[PDB]
Amino acid sequence: GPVPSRARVYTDVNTHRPSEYWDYESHVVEWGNQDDYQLVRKLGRGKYSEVFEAINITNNEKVVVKILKPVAAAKIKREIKILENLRGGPNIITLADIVKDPVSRTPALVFEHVNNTDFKQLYQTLTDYDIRFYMYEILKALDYCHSMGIMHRDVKPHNVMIDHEHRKLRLIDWGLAEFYHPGQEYNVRVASRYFKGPELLVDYQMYDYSLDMWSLGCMLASMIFRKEPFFHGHDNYDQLVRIAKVLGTEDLYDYIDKYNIELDPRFNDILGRHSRKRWERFVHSENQHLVSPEALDFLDKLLRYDHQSRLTAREAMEHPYFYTVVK
Ligand SMILES: NC(=O)c1cc(CNCCCCOCCNc2nc3cc(C(N)=O)ccc3c3cnccc23)cc(OC(F)(F)F)c1
Numbered sequence: 001g002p003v004p005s006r007a008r009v010y011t012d013v014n015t016h017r018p019s020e021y022w023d024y025e026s027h028v029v030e031w032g033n034q035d036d037y038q039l040v041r042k043l044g045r046g047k048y049s050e051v052f053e054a055i056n057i058t059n060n061e062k063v064v065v066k067i068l069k070p071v072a073a074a075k076i077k078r079e080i081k082i083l084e085n086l087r088g089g090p091n092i093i094t095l096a097d098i099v100k101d102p103v104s105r106t107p108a109l110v111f112e113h114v115n116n117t118d119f120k121q122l123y124q125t126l127t128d129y130d131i132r133f134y135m136y137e138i139l140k141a142l143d144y145c146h147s148m149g150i151m152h153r154d155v156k157p158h159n160v161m162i163d164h165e166h167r168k169l170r171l172i173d174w175g176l177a178e179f180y181h182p183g184q185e186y187n188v189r190v191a192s193r194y195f196k197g198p199e200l201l202v203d204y205q206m207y208d209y210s211l212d213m214w215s216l217g218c219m220l221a222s223m224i225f226r227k228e229p230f231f232h233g234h235d236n237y238d239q240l241v242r243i244a245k246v247l248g249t250e251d252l253y254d255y256i257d258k259y260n261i262e263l264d265p266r267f268n269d270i271l272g273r274h275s276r277k278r279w280e281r282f283v284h285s286e287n288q289h290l291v292s293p294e295a296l297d298f299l300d301k302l303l304r305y306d307h308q309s310r311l312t313a314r315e316a317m318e319h320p321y322f323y324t325v326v327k
Pocket of ligand 1: 113119135172174219
């Protein structure tokens with residue numbers, strides 16, 4: 001059967017921390033006062049919740065309220081405990097309160113509000129310097145949560161808020177986040193399709209923080225190459241084929257063989273034989289200003305099949321690509 005795997009960093013953070021830290025089911029939620037918040041406007045709806053812009057009438061400040069749908073109402077302690085554990089950490093969204101909505105009768109998480117600087121075009125007109133700057137900001141959040149024994153498991157543009165006017169970044173939506181325990185088998189049905197790591201696509205459950213680093217690599221490739229999304233799969237199976245057309249099938253088979261992973265036989269009729277492509281294949285006159293030898297070297301060290309061979313968030317922060325960023 002499958003060969004076991006463990007993270008090469010922060011392997012034992014949860015083991016040596018008290019059980020109070022990671023035992024989210026034992027956590028006692030302290031309930032705030034719903035009367036402090038007035039909903040202002042709908043910001044979006046997902047499969048398990050709805051998010052609204054709101055005002056805290058006790059201080060006149062804007063907040064964002066996530067109202068859980070009755071189905072996900074029982075599963076809130078994991079997200080609450082992760083948010084409390086990470087509160088105050090660099091670029092992590094702040095959980096301001098937890099109240100019970102009077103209409104839905106379900107839990108509502110109240111978050112810090114970030115001034116949005118429009119996503120219709122603003123995150124397409126980012127300069128090469130801005131890309132490095134914001135990528136370093138995301139790395140601070142990921143190294144922090146990984147150092148705290150938490151994997152985000154849903155890194156994607158929709159979960160990265162940017163107030164470009166104040167150069168402020170927050171990593172949001174910790175609803176899929178989980179505590180890392182070495183040897184634990186996790187659900188592979190996490191992350192959005194275009195950002196799923198090869199470990200999820202091949203059904204390898206013993207993954208770790210390095211899943212976030214693959215997702216970060218997908219984001220970086222899309223920004224520097226202006227190809228959104230970078231790996232544009234039609235479904236979860238075609239997603240792996242899209243990846244194999246870039247990284248090649250030989251390294252994919254080396255990966256599955258290393259961990260004694262048997263590929264889903266449905267891949268036999270779609271995978272084919274592909275060589276590893278050189279990164280300069282994706283460079284053209286319209287993206288060359290965002291590309292540099294440092295960007296390609298960095299991207300190459302994130303987008304690797306072997307989850308154990310990718311740069312960790314701390315190693316990524318040491319990379320030459322970030323030398324030009326003012327620290
Ligand atoms: N490739 C690219 O195009 C791209 C695009 C972006 C921009 N993405 C914006 C996505 C907006 C999605 O809005 C969701 C609705 N609004 C809010 N939702 C919340 C949910 C929670 C929560 N559930 O935890 C908590 C708080 C808030 C919150 C708070 N203040 C205001 C509004 C909200 C960045 C990028 O990253 C980069 F790489 F660094 F550059 C790349």
